[PDB]
Amino acid sequence: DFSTIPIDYVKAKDPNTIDFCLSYLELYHTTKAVKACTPFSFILGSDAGMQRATETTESLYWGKVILDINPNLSPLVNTTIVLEIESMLSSNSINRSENKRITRYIEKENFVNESSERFEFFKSMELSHLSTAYDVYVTFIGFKIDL
């Protein structure tokens, strides 16, 4: 072997495993010095006691992000929720991180409450916009890649 910490060409061929992620980055994300990766998890929220953005920089996240919005029984303001997510899927072509936003528009009648799981491969997670009436929670279950 005598390669870097990531290991390629392993018989483990499954989309959810970190092996698929490593094999994909070593093949279609050249000019990126991939260092050791570890299974990581973190949570961002809207209420006090949590951070609105990831402190890490120049580190690629791969895994499933769980969006969660619930009502806190508070007066409404008629704003919108915006969660801007970077995207390195097309980073090689343009040498930039694509910006993707997941938005649920808030009505005074449509009393929204839903939770869902999505797959993303991003750099940083930021809650650019927020509504004080609701509760927002995002959880990441995947792997962190150091560059």
Author numbering: -2 to 144
Question: What is the paper's account of this structure, in its own sentences?
Answer:
In this study, we report a detailed characterization of ΦCjT23, an icosahedral temperate ssDNA phage with an inner lipid membrane, isolated earlier from a strain of Flavobacterium (previously Cytophaga). The virion structure determined by cryogenic electron microscopy reveals similarities to members of the viral kingdom Bamfordvirae that currently consists solely of dsDNA viruses with a major capsid protein composed of two upright β-sandwiches. The minimalistic structure of ΦCjT23 suggests that this phage serves as a model for the last common ancestor between ssDNA and dsDNA viruses in the Bamfordvirae. Both ΦCjT23 and the related phage FLiP infect Flavobacterium species found in several environments, suggesting that these types of viruses have a global distribution and a shared evolutionary origin.
Earlier, we reported a phylogenetic connection between phage PM2 and the ssDNA phage FLiP (Finnlakevirus FLiP, Finnlakeviridae), which infects flavobacteria. Structurally, however, the two share the same capsid organization, characterized by the triangulation (T) number pseudo T = 21 dextro. Following the approach applied to the MCPs, we calculated a localized reconstruction of the internal part of ΦCjT23 spike (penton domain), in addition to the FLiP penton base from our previously published data. The resolutions of the localized reconstructions for ΦCjT23 and FLiP were 3.4 and 4.0 Å, respectively. This was sufficient to build the corresponding atomic models de novo. As expected, the structure of the FLiP penton revealed a pentamer formed by five copies of protein P12 (encoded by orf12) with the canonical β-sandwich fold, similar to penton base proteins of PM2 and PRD1. This confirmed that the FLiP spike is formed by a separate protein forming a pentamer sitting atop the capsid integral penton base.
